[PDB]
Amino acid sequence: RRRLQRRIAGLLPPPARRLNISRGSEFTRDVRGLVEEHAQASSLSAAAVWRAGLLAPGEVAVAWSGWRPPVFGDFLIHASSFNNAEATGTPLFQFKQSDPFSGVDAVFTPLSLFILMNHGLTRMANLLYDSPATLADLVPDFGRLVADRRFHNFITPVGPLVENIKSTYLNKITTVVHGPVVSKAIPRSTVKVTVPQEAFVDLDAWLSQPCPADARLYVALTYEEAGPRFTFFQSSRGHCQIMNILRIYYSPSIMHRYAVVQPLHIEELTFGAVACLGTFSATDGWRRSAFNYRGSSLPVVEIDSFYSNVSDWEVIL
Amino acid sequence: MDLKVVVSLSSRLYTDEIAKMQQRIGCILPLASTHGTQNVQGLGLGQVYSLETVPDYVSMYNYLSDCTLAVLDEVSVDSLILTKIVPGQTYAIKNKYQPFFQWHGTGSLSVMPPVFGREHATVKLESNDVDIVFPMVLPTPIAEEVLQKILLFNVYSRVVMQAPGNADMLDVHMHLGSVSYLGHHYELALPEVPGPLGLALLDNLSLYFCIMVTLLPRASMRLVRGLNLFQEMVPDEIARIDLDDLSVADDLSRMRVMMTYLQSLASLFNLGPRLATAAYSQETLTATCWLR
Amino acid sequence: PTIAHGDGRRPSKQRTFIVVKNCHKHHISTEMELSMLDLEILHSIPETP
């Protein structure tokens, strides 16, 4: 009954949320304990681990805040299939391979996906990948898998890259599949998801009341007449709205697909699919930039502060 | 923040019960409550997938989407210490299911109620008279294909027990007897004799689906007369100019029951409690997943 | 122990090997005669030299 007191005194304390500040010039111990957050990294010493508290269970606590650590999904890829000059924050799209026991993976950035679709944006695609044939056999039968319009249920978005070690023959990437996208380096710095500007469109800008707490990034494969395209939507609504909103936005191209060809078949009838990619702050995100290569540059959409959270593929019609 | 749901047994187990349980030390099962101790009668799918009543996919799926789920961790002789899945954290599950569908990394897992026979997913406990039924956990594209192929097998068995002049029993079996995903070519255990007057699994879902697509064409006719020309070129016109006069009470009743049978079915083909994996390592048959 | 590899490989964790070694027993037995006459002589006590 007193052992329970000493135990419940340790299991009691929630983090002190409010605090009576007196003067901002004071910077006393209470406000430092409010602003201090423990790191996921320290040097391998006894004092550094025992002060950073790396061995704490569940979270990192020196010796439940709305903060959870992320989860990494590491893939091993053919090093020719992934141009290593790409930045940290680019959304990768792992193709579910038809090989039964293959331990090698086939990820795609959307730039590498563009030369897969078609076979400035095209200039940076062909400068980043001089070879449209070593990716045309990663998918073994692209013409069949698109001509029966089942390409959307084979591509699993795995969120953005965070760290990529450049090995020579078989490349190892570390992505973030779910949660808060943040770097793991010895100086920690911010990671920003970069999507190409010509591919990225907006949805509040296309429509031109309330402000939400977060906006959700959407990816959208769609089967047109001239091949598939990977547009990237950003929306601040909910999903069940966005299905009807993109049905309105594609209601031109739905009539165009029924018009320029008549679907005598039955597997052609789907018109793309959309999958949520996660939430970011709806206020100051997607500040544009340009991704500078050795000789050229494409304009890029640099979404800061991503919470990666993949959803599944829902058809559009 | 602790998660140990230690369910206690009244009468302690034998050795062979522990021998069956230690081969399912990584599967998940639905609880009844999220409380610190429980009894055995709240565990996985006993009360709804019992052997004494006719079972149906609908109420099993509703109960499975209803309550909390829980991977099991330890099996003592008289207690089953386990942990429940909250959406805040991520867990380590194992594919120890008797229809062994090979998982993959960064795949999405569907917690399905068992279709492949009760005896494939059970731990028949004798010391306590309980049947811990474990729910089927298998990847979502395989879940979709196995639902389509158990459903069409149900409809096609029912029409050939309706009349043998409909179809041939090998022709339904040499297509729907196998599920294919990434080259892993499995074979499905099919109950070739389900028995008439229902009394079997997947009748209530098949009855729902067949009543839905029966009420479908006049529903489409009513909802295109209510409102254009593109919508009147994709279907054939014999489904367009069919009746144009039904009694309004029966029309409203048919449309309402079609709407309920559509919304339950469409909520059902979304597989409910869906889990999303990160790094499935089949050297130890471990998948790392979270509640999605 | 394990070597930290920089390149792209699946990292092998803490490995620890448990191996058991059992004993072998060996039985040995020879047989030796002894007559009954000198056993009776052992049971007897002599008088004459």
XYZ file of C-alpha atoms in Angstrom:
658
model
C 0.000 0.000 0.000
C 3.130 2.140 0.119
C 5.038 0.207 -2.521
C 1.963 1.013 -4.605
C 2.509 4.679 -3.706
C 6.076 4.707 -5.030
C 4.977 2.794 -8.131
C 1.969 4.986 -8.877
C 4.098 8.103 -8.380
C 6.191 6.873 -11.292
C 3.223 5.898 -13.442
C 1.310 9.115 -12.633
C 2.869 12.137 -14.308
C 1.517 13.183 -17.669
C 3.580 15.821 -19.474
C 2.812 19.251 -18.028
C 0.966 20.966 -20.858
C 0.128 24.414 -19.482
C 2.587 26.485 -17.475
C 2.320 29.844 -15.715
C 5.102 31.848 -17.323
C 6.187 35.023 -15.533
C 8.724 36.795 -17.761
C 10.109 35.610 -21.080
C 13.584 36.834 -20.170
C 13.752 34.410 -17.233
C 14.031 31.125 -19.219
C 13.791 29.093 -16.038
C 13.925 25.333 -15.524
C 10.174 24.755 -15.934
C 9.973 26.284 -19.392
C 13.132 24.392 -20.397
C 11.524 21.148 -19.273
C 8.474 22.104 -21.287
C 10.436 22.841 -24.462
C 12.958 19.988 -24.192
C 12.400 17.017 -26.472
C 14.615 13.962 -26.469
C 16.422 12.804 -29.576
C 16.491 9.472 -31.373
C 20.293 9.678 -31.494
C 23.357 10.096 -29.304
C 26.984 9.048 -29.341
C 27.789 5.512 -28.239
C 29.010 6.250 -24.740
C 27.631 5.410 -21.317
C 27.096 9.044 -20.308
C 25.571 10.032 -23.648
C 23.077 7.159 -23.740
C 22.286 7.476 -20.028
C 21.629 11.215 -20.458
C 19.803 11.005 -23.782
C 17.850 8.067 -22.377
C 18.010 5.907 -25.506
C 17.210 2.735 -23.556
C 13.834 3.920 -22.381
C 10.904 1.624 -23.228
C 8.349 2.829 -25.770
C 9.625 6.396 -26.146
C 12.901 8.179 -25.360
C 12.940 9.451 -21.782
C 15.863 10.280 -19.498
C 15.949 8.235 -16.282
C 2.306 9.503 -24.635
C 3.185 13.017 -25.758
C 1.151 12.699 -28.947
C 4.402 11.775 -30.716
C 5.194 8.370 -32.151
C 8.397 7.202 -33.869
C 8.136 6.287 -37.558
C 8.432 2.870 -39.161
C 10.914 2.199 -41.971
C 10.456 -0.189 -44.849
C 13.776 -1.005 -46.482
C 13.956 -2.228 -50.067
C 16.814 -3.686 -52.083
C 16.760 -2.594 -55.719
C 18.801 -2.907 -58.877
C 21.101 0.102 -58.761
C 20.476 0.972 -62.409
C 16.732 1.270 -61.785
C 17.044 4.098 -59.251
C 19.004 7.208 -60.215
C 20.943 7.968 -57.050
C 21.066 11.727 -57.673
C 17.440 12.029 -56.570
C 16.756 13.916 -53.369
C 15.688 12.541 -50.015
C 12.017 13.403 -50.063
C 10.654 11.740 -53.149
C 7.608 9.454 -53.011
C 8.605 5.929 -53.941
C 6.230 3.429 -55.518
C 7.199 -0.205 -55.015
C 5.918 -2.495 -57.749
C 4.659 -5.805 -56.360
C 6.856 -8.200 -58.295
C 5.394 -11.265 -59.974
C 8.474 -13.309 -59.078
C 7.631 -15.749 -56.249
C 10.707 -15.578 -54.016
C 12.495 -12.475 -55.277
C 14.415 -10.660 -52.582
C 15.180 -7.792 -54.952
C 12.671 -4.968 -55.270
C 11.630 -2.585 -58.045
C 10.821 0.818 -56.612
C 9.991 3.846 -58.733
C 10.223 7.549 -58.277
C 7.537 9.272 -60.418
C 10.248 10.556 -62.778
C 11.335 6.969 -63.430
C 7.650 6.160 -63.645
C 7.201 8.751 -66.402
C 9.506 6.989 -68.869
C 7.696 3.781 -67.990
C 4.394 5.445 -68.879
C 5.416 7.078 -72.159
C 7.338 4.082 -73.480
C 11.050 20.009 -68.491
C 9.600 16.734 -67.271
C 10.596 14.544 -70.224
C 14.025 16.180 -70.448
C 14.771 15.570 -66.772
C 13.332 12.064 -67.087
C 15.588 11.116 -69.988
C 18.574 12.851 -68.395
C 18.006 11.050 -65.092
C 17.447 7.793 -66.993
C 19.163 7.515 -70.363
C 17.806 3.965 -70.711
C 14.057 3.365 -71.124
C 14.639 -0.376 -71.504
C 16.064 -1.562 -68.181
C 12.850 -0.370 -66.524
C 10.589 -1.682 -69.288
C 11.443 -5.230 -68.172
C 11.094 -4.619 -64.434
C 7.420 -4.744 -65.134
C 7.567 -7.862 -67.317
C 4.474 -7.246 -69.464
C 3.598 -3.578 -69.146
C 1.453 -3.573 -72.275
C -0.665 -6.450 -71.005
C -0.877 -5.220 -67.397
C -2.049 -1.800 -68.608
C -4.151 -3.062 -71.536
C -6.322 -5.013 -69.082
C -6.380 -1.936 -66.778
C -5.197 -3.685 -63.631
C -2.147 -1.533 -63.067
C -3.471 0.298 -60.031
C -3.778 -2.710 -57.718
C -0.172 -3.765 -58.379
C 1.547 -0.517 -57.363
C 1.860 -0.032 -53.630
C 2.965 3.488 -52.650
C 5.511 3.222 -49.870
C 5.832 6.910 -49.127
C 8.999 8.970 -49.376
C 12.632 8.008 -49.199
C 14.535 9.307 -46.206
C 18.057 7.803 -46.391
C 19.732 6.138 -49.380
C 23.144 4.525 -49.143
C 24.645 4.455 -52.632
C 25.966 0.956 -53.040
C 27.377 -0.102 -56.376
C 25.604 -3.242 -57.557
C 22.442 -3.819 -55.510
C 21.137 -0.685 -53.869
C 19.629 -0.401 -50.390
C 17.134 2.380 -49.722
C 15.414 3.170 -46.457
C 11.934 4.583 -46.955
C 9.263 5.611 -44.474
C 6.068 3.637 -45.007
C 4.040 5.096 -42.166
C 4.237 7.959 -39.735
C 6.324 11.105 -39.399
C 8.918 11.600 -42.131
C 12.108 12.801 -40.444
C 15.789 12.194 -41.122
C 18.130 9.902 -39.247
C 21.515 11.576 -39.632
C 24.094 12.685 -37.110
C 23.135 16.289 -37.794
C 19.396 15.886 -38.060
C 17.863 18.069 -40.752
C 14.390 18.432 -42.209
C 13.156 16.162 -44.995
C 10.723 17.587 -47.525
C 8.742 15.524 -50.033
C 9.553 16.773 -53.535
C 7.030 16.097 -56.312
C 7.570 17.394 -59.887
C 5.696 20.595 -60.675
C 4.270 19.515 -64.032
C 2.894 16.341 -62.448
C 1.673 17.980 -59.240
C -1.639 19.796 -59.524
C -3.638 21.329 -56.721
C -7.315 20.985 -55.921
C -8.193 24.079 -53.925
C -6.480 26.092 -56.656
C -8.482 24.307 -59.338
C -11.780 24.925 -57.562
C -10.545 28.444 -56.599
C -15.305 27.765 -45.968
C -13.431 26.411 -42.895
C -9.711 25.983 -42.484
C -8.711 22.401 -41.606
C -5.853 21.341 -39.373
C -4.106 19.356 -42.116
C -4.136 18.694 -45.847
C -3.757 15.308 -47.480
C -1.563 14.515 -50.472
C -3.178 12.318 -53.094
C -1.592 10.248 -55.839
C -3.661 9.298 -58.865
C -2.939 6.904 -61.665
C -5.399 7.355 -64.525
C -5.793 5.436 -67.775
C -6.167 7.891 -70.666
C -6.097 7.275 -74.403
C -2.405 8.163 -74.827
C -1.286 6.000 -71.915
C -1.379 6.282 -68.144
C -0.411 9.412 -66.246
C 0.573 9.951 -62.616
C -0.887 13.265 -61.485
C -0.446 14.303 -57.867
C -3.354 16.064 -56.151
C -3.224 18.027 -52.918
C -6.497 18.423 -51.060
C -7.686 19.708 -47.712
C -10.997 17.802 -47.720
C -11.974 14.292 -46.699
C -11.645 11.187 -48.840
C -15.335 10.589 -49.528
C -15.645 14.122 -50.849
C -12.492 13.761 -52.944
C -13.806 10.717 -54.822
C -16.786 12.749 -56.091
C -14.651 15.865 -56.601
C -12.193 14.008 -58.819
C -15.129 12.329 -60.545
C -16.239 15.862 -61.444
C -12.671 16.827 -62.414
C -12.337 13.761 -64.658
C -15.905 13.984 -66.055
C -14.313 15.653 -69.096
C -11.816 12.813 -69.512
C -14.416 10.143 -68.661
C -16.477 11.231 -71.666
C -13.227 11.518 -73.639
C -12.305 7.905 -72.837
C -15.795 6.718 -73.737
C -15.696 8.865 -76.887
C -12.298 8.381 -78.565
C -12.600 4.600 -78.083
C -15.698 2.532 -77.398
C -15.076 -0.079 -74.671
C -16.392 -3.249 -76.293
C -14.392 -5.118 -73.627
C -15.244 -5.210 -69.948
C -11.845 -4.868 -68.226
C -11.190 -1.486 -69.874
C -14.104 0.074 -67.990
C -12.181 1.417 -64.977
C -10.846 4.971 -65.176
C -7.831 5.088 -62.900
C -7.656 5.033 -59.124
C -6.609 7.329 -56.286
C -4.767 6.506 -53.070
C -4.084 8.799 -50.136
C -0.440 9.326 -49.294
C -0.579 11.064 -45.941
C -1.199 14.352 -44.167
C 0.805 17.574 -43.959
C 0.165 21.039 -42.544
C -2.437 22.797 -44.683
C -1.093 26.293 -43.979
C 2.477 26.714 -45.224
C 3.139 23.590 -47.285
C 4.169 22.990 -50.913
C 6.507 25.928 -51.336
C 7.851 25.423 -54.834
C 11.496 25.033 -55.820
C 13.638 23.599 -58.614
C 15.623 20.357 -58.421
C 19.019 21.104 -59.916
C 20.752 18.283 -61.784
C 24.231 18.417 -63.358
C 23.040 20.201 -66.488
C 19.334 21.007 -66.255
C 16.560 21.527 -63.721
C 12.935 20.795 -63.362
C 10.512 22.797 -61.192
C 9.574 20.843 -58.093
C 6.963 20.961 -55.325
C 8.635 20.789 -51.936
C 6.015 19.720 -49.377
C 7.558 20.212 -45.954
C 6.353 18.485 -42.776
C 4.848 15.243 -44.032
C 3.082 12.595 -41.959
C 3.341 9.573 -44.229
C 0.217 7.424 -44.159
C -0.622 5.302 -47.176
C -4.163 4.272 -47.995
C -5.301 1.666 -50.459
C -6.448 2.001 -54.045
C -10.036 3.069 -54.691
C -11.374 3.226 -58.246
C -12.662 6.492 -59.719
C -14.947 5.898 -62.720
C 1.048 2.441 -20.855
C 0.648 -1.331 -20.610
C -1.409 -3.664 -22.807
C -1.353 -7.102 -21.147
C -4.758 -8.757 -21.449
C -4.178 -11.849 -19.314
C -7.118 -14.163 -19.877
C -7.302 -16.725 -17.083
C -8.492 -20.302 -17.490
C -10.798 -21.887 -14.933
C -9.584 -25.476 -15.268
C -5.972 -25.786 -16.357
C -4.938 -27.312 -19.646
C -3.382 -30.619 -20.649
C -0.093 -30.952 -22.504
C -1.425 -31.409 -26.052
C -3.536 -28.248 -25.791
C -0.320 -26.359 -25.033
C 1.269 -28.250 -27.928
C -1.382 -26.850 -30.252
C -1.217 -23.366 -28.725
C 2.565 -23.058 -29.004
C 2.206 -23.475 -32.769
C -0.185 -20.501 -32.797
C 1.883 -18.238 -30.565
C 1.840 -15.396 -33.076
C -1.664 -15.269 -34.519
C -4.248 -12.644 -33.652
C -7.692 -13.140 -32.150
C -10.586 -10.847 -31.216
C -11.286 -10.153 -27.566
C -14.569 -9.117 -26.005
C -13.402 -6.254 -23.784
C -10.263 -4.197 -23.279
C -9.916 -5.057 -19.591
C -6.923 -6.350 -17.716
C -8.191 -9.836 -16.886
C -10.874 -11.817 -18.676
C -12.494 -15.217 -18.930
C -12.259 -17.561 -21.862
C -15.796 -17.075 -23.215
C -14.959 -13.668 -24.674
C -12.202 -14.906 -26.980
C -12.027 -15.312 -30.710
C -15.233 -15.996 -32.614
C -16.607 -18.744 -30.395
C -19.993 -17.199 -29.702
C -20.681 -16.177 -33.309
C -18.804 -18.891 -35.225
C -20.137 -21.757 -33.177
C -20.688 -25.242 -34.525
C -24.259 -25.579 -33.232
C -25.980 -22.886 -35.320
C -25.769 -22.043 -38.976
C -22.959 -19.493 -39.390
C -22.934 -16.600 -41.823
C -20.216 -14.317 -43.128
C -22.159 -11.148 -42.338
C -22.494 -11.304 -38.551
C -19.013 -12.809 -38.253
C -17.603 -9.878 -40.213
C -19.659 -7.447 -38.116
C -18.367 -8.893 -34.854
C -14.818 -8.991 -36.193
C -14.985 -5.333 -37.182
C -16.741 -4.639 -33.874
C -14.422 -5.613 -31.056
C -10.756 -5.080 -30.338
C -8.247 -7.563 -31.684
C -5.204 -9.015 -30.001
C -2.110 -10.929 -31.006
C -1.295 -13.578 -28.434
C 2.103 -13.603 -26.765
C 2.473 -16.285 -24.094
C 0.579 -19.487 -23.367
C 1.014 -20.655 -19.806
C -0.658 -23.826 -18.604
C -3.567 -21.970 -16.999
C -3.274 -18.407 -18.354
C -2.921 -16.936 -21.843
C -1.012 -13.663 -21.510
C -1.683 -11.615 -24.626
C -1.598 -8.033 -25.911
C -4.230 -6.025 -27.767
C -3.655 -3.871 -30.842
C -4.228 -0.136 -30.485
C -3.849 2.157 -33.517
C -1.069 4.111 -31.795
C 1.697 1.525 -32.011
C 3.010 -1.255 -34.235
C 3.253 -4.971 -33.550
C 4.933 -8.214 -34.582
C 2.603 -10.882 -35.971
C 3.337 -14.248 -37.599
C 1.654 -16.109 -40.457
C 0.893 -19.335 -38.607
C -2.424 -19.908 -40.375
C -3.190 -23.411 -41.617
C -4.149 -22.320 -45.139
C -0.651 -20.936 -45.549
C -0.806 -17.877 -47.780
C 2.700 -16.478 -48.164
C 2.858 -12.863 -47.067
C 5.040 -10.091 -48.451
C 6.703 -6.970 -47.151
C 4.765 -3.653 -47.318
C 1.569 -5.545 -48.068
C -1.861 -4.860 -46.605
C -3.408 -7.590 -44.474
C -7.106 -8.368 -44.108
C -8.449 -9.848 -40.873
C -11.140 -12.083 -42.300
C -13.516 -14.418 -40.512
C -12.691 -18.082 -41.262
C -14.031 -19.562 -44.490
C -11.703 -22.538 -45.017
C -13.268 -24.739 -42.359
C -13.500 -24.451 -38.596
C -10.994 -27.242 -38.019
C -8.238 -25.445 -39.912
C -8.432 -22.461 -37.554
C -9.249 -23.770 -34.089
C -7.635 -24.843 -30.861
C -10.139 -27.374 -29.534
C -9.843 -26.930 -25.783
C -11.245 -29.783 -23.715
C -10.370 -28.869 -20.116
C -12.566 -25.845 -20.597
C -15.384 -26.363 -23.097
C -14.345 -23.517 -25.386
C -13.330 -23.419 -29.044
C -10.829 -20.633 -29.665
C -11.544 -19.879 -33.326
C -8.813 -17.871 -34.858
C -9.811 -15.414 -37.595
C -8.178 -15.734 -40.996
C -5.450 -13.147 -41.591
C -4.286 -13.041 -45.196
C -3.272 -10.340 -47.704
C -5.946 -8.094 -49.229
C -5.603 -8.984 -52.963
C -5.772 -12.662 -52.059
C -8.706 -11.740 -49.799
C -10.488 -10.136 -52.736
C -9.839 -13.056 -55.081
C -10.815 -15.670 -52.499
C -14.047 -13.793 -51.785
C -14.900 -13.622 -55.492
C -14.041 -17.291 -55.910
C -15.932 -18.542 -52.857
C -18.913 -16.410 -53.836
C -19.077 -17.534 -57.453
C -18.548 -21.112 -56.296
C -21.517 -20.712 -53.953
C -23.734 -19.304 -56.711
C -22.611 -21.921 -59.208
C -23.101 -24.784 -56.769
C -26.567 -23.478 -55.961
C -27.564 -23.279 -59.613
C -26.379 -26.821 -60.387
C -28.193 -28.158 -57.336
C -31.127 -26.141 -58.681
C -30.883 -27.852 -62.070
C -28.136 -30.124 -63.465
C -28.713 -28.674 -66.947
C -27.009 -25.409 -65.972
C -23.270 -26.064 -65.722
C -20.649 -28.763 -65.257
C -19.075 -29.357 -61.860
C -15.545 -29.660 -63.219
C -15.862 -26.380 -65.157
C -16.642 -24.403 -61.999
C -13.847 -26.215 -60.174
C -11.023 -25.921 -62.713
C -11.257 -22.110 -62.522
C -12.444 -21.230 -59.012
C -10.475 -23.957 -57.271
C -7.286 -21.921 -57.296
C -6.249 -18.442 -56.185
C -3.254 -16.796 -57.880
C -1.203 -13.859 -56.589
C 2.443 -13.131 -57.531
C 2.802 -16.634 -58.942
C 1.976 -18.316 -55.633
C -0.650 -20.644 -57.068
C -2.731 -21.972 -54.178
C -5.599 -24.456 -54.149
C -8.802 -23.795 -52.229
C -10.689 -26.229 -50.016
C -14.228 -26.103 -51.334
C -17.280 -27.683 -49.665
C -18.706 -29.450 -52.708
C -21.856 -30.358 -50.783
C -23.125 -27.248 -48.972
C -26.642 -28.616 -48.544
C -29.919 -26.969 -49.542
C -32.081 -24.629 -47.427
C -28.984 -22.646 -46.509
C -27.532 -24.400 -43.407
C -24.017 -23.379 -44.513
C -21.512 -20.551 -44.671
C -21.616 -18.006 -47.539
C -25.307 -18.476 -48.237
C -26.462 -15.250 -46.579
C -23.827 -13.259 -48.449
C -24.670 -14.989 -51.727
C -28.383 -14.441 -51.128
C -27.686 -10.756 -50.466
C -25.560 -10.421 -53.637
C -28.084 -12.217 -55.866
C -31.044 -10.212 -54.566
C -28.960 -7.057 -55.128
C -28.104 -7.761 -58.748
C -31.676 -8.959 -59.271
C -33.048 -5.603 -58.116
C -30.248 -3.733 -59.932
C -31.718 -3.141 -63.458
C -35.014 -1.496 -62.491
C -33.036 0.465 -59.897
C -30.818 1.787 -62.693
C -33.896 2.465 -64.850
C -35.560 4.410 -62.030
C -32.428 6.411 -61.287
C -31.948 7.345 -64.931
C -35.607 8.303 -65.354
C -35.260 10.392 -62.205
C -32.602 12.512 -63.885
C -27.654 11.536 -69.129
C -27.296 10.293 -72.705
C -23.832 8.827 -72.077
C -25.466 6.884 -69.236
C -28.031 5.627 -71.782
C -25.453 4.245 -74.250
C -23.254 2.020 -72.055
C -26.006 -0.512 -71.112
C -28.198 -2.274 -73.625
C -31.598 -0.691 -74.193
C -33.520 -3.844 -73.212
C -32.517 -2.980 -69.641
C -33.720 0.590 -70.326
C -37.270 0.330 -71.686
C -38.214 -2.739 -69.662
C -41.245 -1.897 -67.499
C -41.897 1.855 -66.814
C -44.896 0.986 -64.575
C -44.617 -0.587 -61.135
C -46.697 0.033 -58.030
C -45.067 2.799 -56.012
C -45.162 0.948 -52.687
C -43.455 -2.108 -54.190
C -41.035 0.111 -56.132
C -40.047 1.982 -52.968
C -39.800 -1.259 -50.977
C -37.585 -2.900 -53.615
C -35.394 0.200 -53.895
C -34.989 0.471 -50.125
C -34.097 -3.187 -49.633
C -31.727 -2.972 -52.620
C -30.104 0.021 -50.971
C -29.625 -1.800 -47.655
C -28.324 -4.903 -49.436
C -25.940 -2.671 -51.373
C -24.614 -0.716 -48.419
C -24.041 -3.792 -46.247
C -22.348 -5.597 -49.147
C -20.187 -2.601 -50.034
C -19.148 -2.164 -46.417
C -18.395 -5.889 -46.429
C -16.150 -6.014 -49.499
C -14.034 -3.464 -47.718
C -12.395 -6.029 -45.494
C -12.921 -4.233 -42.194
C -9.971 -4.372 -39.826
C -7.119 -3.849 -42.258
C -3.482 -4.102 -41.235
C -0.504 -2.725 -43.141
C 2.895 -4.406 -42.960
C 6.387 -2.935 -43.117
C 9.120 -5.611 -43.299
C 7.936 -9.208 -43.614
C 10.919 -11.482 -42.966
C 10.068 -15.105 -43.736
C 13.356 -16.339 -42.314
C 11.441 -16.233 -39.022
C 7.955 -15.866 -40.621
C 7.581 -12.513 -38.845
C 5.714 -9.532 -40.238
C 5.933 -6.133 -38.567
C 2.619 -4.317 -38.826
C 0.481 -1.683 -37.161
C -3.235 -1.093 -36.900
C -4.339 0.768 -40.006
C 30.284 -11.107 -32.966
C 29.433 -9.433 -36.268
C 31.040 -6.867 -38.588
C 29.100 -3.708 -39.396
C 28.815 -3.638 -43.183
C 28.451 -0.319 -44.937
C 27.072 -1.685 -48.187
C 23.574 -2.855 -48.950
C 22.946 -6.122 -47.137
C 20.388 -7.476 -44.722
C 22.004 -6.898 -41.318
C 22.593 -9.976 -39.190
C 21.737 -9.210 -35.570
C 23.120 -10.522 -32.291
C 23.749 -14.210 -32.966
C 24.188 -16.640 -30.084
C 24.671 -20.371 -30.598
C 23.474 -23.018 -28.168
C 25.012 -26.460 -28.664
C 24.906 -29.477 -26.354
C 27.447 -32.248 -25.871
C 26.408 -35.552 -24.315
C 28.570 -38.120 -22.587
C 29.302 -41.678 -23.678
C 29.435 -44.505 -21.150
C 31.569 -47.582 -21.819
C 31.209 -50.930 -20.058
C 34.016 -53.476 -19.705
C 34.035 -56.889 -18.068
C 36.429 -59.825 -18.131
C 35.890 -63.233 -16.576
C 38.386 -65.194 -14.512
C 38.145 -68.784 -13.312
C 39.034 -69.920 -9.813
C 38.853 -73.598 -8.908
C 36.713 -74.976 -6.132
C 39.563 -76.970 -4.566
C 41.702 -73.982 -3.603
C 38.523 -72.175 -2.570
C 37.889 -75.032 -0.131
C 41.547 -74.743 0.887
C 40.921 -71.044 1.565
C 37.902 -72.070 3.620
C 40.082 -74.665 5.364
C 42.833 -74.147 7.926
C 45.963 -76.270 7.385
C 47.825 -78.251 10.037
C 50.487 -80.370 8.340
C 53.212 -78.379 6.538
